[PDB]
């Protein structure tokens, strides 16, 4: 299930502990820099009416989830490709080899790359295996991005805040409006509690991970 069940369990636990009602809140105490995620989606472009969803990961790699549920990933070296059919079957290729099979999808991918590079701002710019985008959807309030390493990222439209959930670390990273990165250990959030806004977004995240599992 790509650790969705695990993540669901970790969020029910933090939310059940009602961490914004704790009298003596020390959210600063729940931080843990040995849980900082390796990957997250730094930019994305929804062209899903026509071709699909383009994105860039923080390592500068660029991927597309095409409508046919195939994925093409261009590594940060500008040439090496990874290709995933619906089957999940992976294969590796290079741009320079010019594979006749994927000419069209390469061109599309380069368009997405071009657009993102010139027109979009990076997420989490001022801080320091290659997964692909498994699934995604968006509500009025947010886009939800589920990576194949189990990570779930939720980007909120209103205020530009972002959640990155890592079930393997049982951790949450929170990017605020001021672009500040903070990484928390979920269990420690139950103990030290947190602010009302991190709290409501974790309630929203549990509902969103529910939604992923009903599909
Ligand atoms: Br219709 C040209 C095109 C294709 C893929 C992505 C983008 I952004 C634009």
Residue numbers in the entry: 371 to 498, 507 to 593
What text appears in the publication on this structure?
The human polo-like kinase 1 (PLK1) is a key regulator of chromosome segregation during mitosis, through its essential biological functions in chromosome condensation, cohesin dissociation from chromosomes, mitotic entry, centrosome maturation, kinetochore function, spindle assembly, and exit from mitosis. Intriguingly, recent crystallographic studies have identified a hydrophobic pocket within the human PLK1 PBD, located adjacent to the phosphosubstrate binding groove, which may regulate substrate recognition. Seven hydrophobic amino acid residues line the pocket; whilst V415, L478, and F482 cover the bottom of the pocket, the Tyr residues Y417, Y421, Y481 and Y485, form its sides.
While designed to be a phospho-peptide mimetic, Polotyrin was found to occupy the Tyr pocket, with the iodophenyl moiety occupying the Tyr pocket and the thiophene ring stacking against Tyr481. The binding opens the pocket, flipping both Tyr 481 and Tyr417 out of its way, akin to what a long PBD-binding phosphopeptide would do. Given this unexpected binding mode, we confirmed the binding of Polotyrin by soaking the crystals with an analogue of the Tyr-binding iodophenyl group, 3-iodobenzyl bromide. Thus, these findings provide proof-of-principle, and a structural blueprint, for the future design of a novel class of PLK1 inhibitors that modulate substrate recognition by the PLK1 PBD by targeting the Tyr pocket.
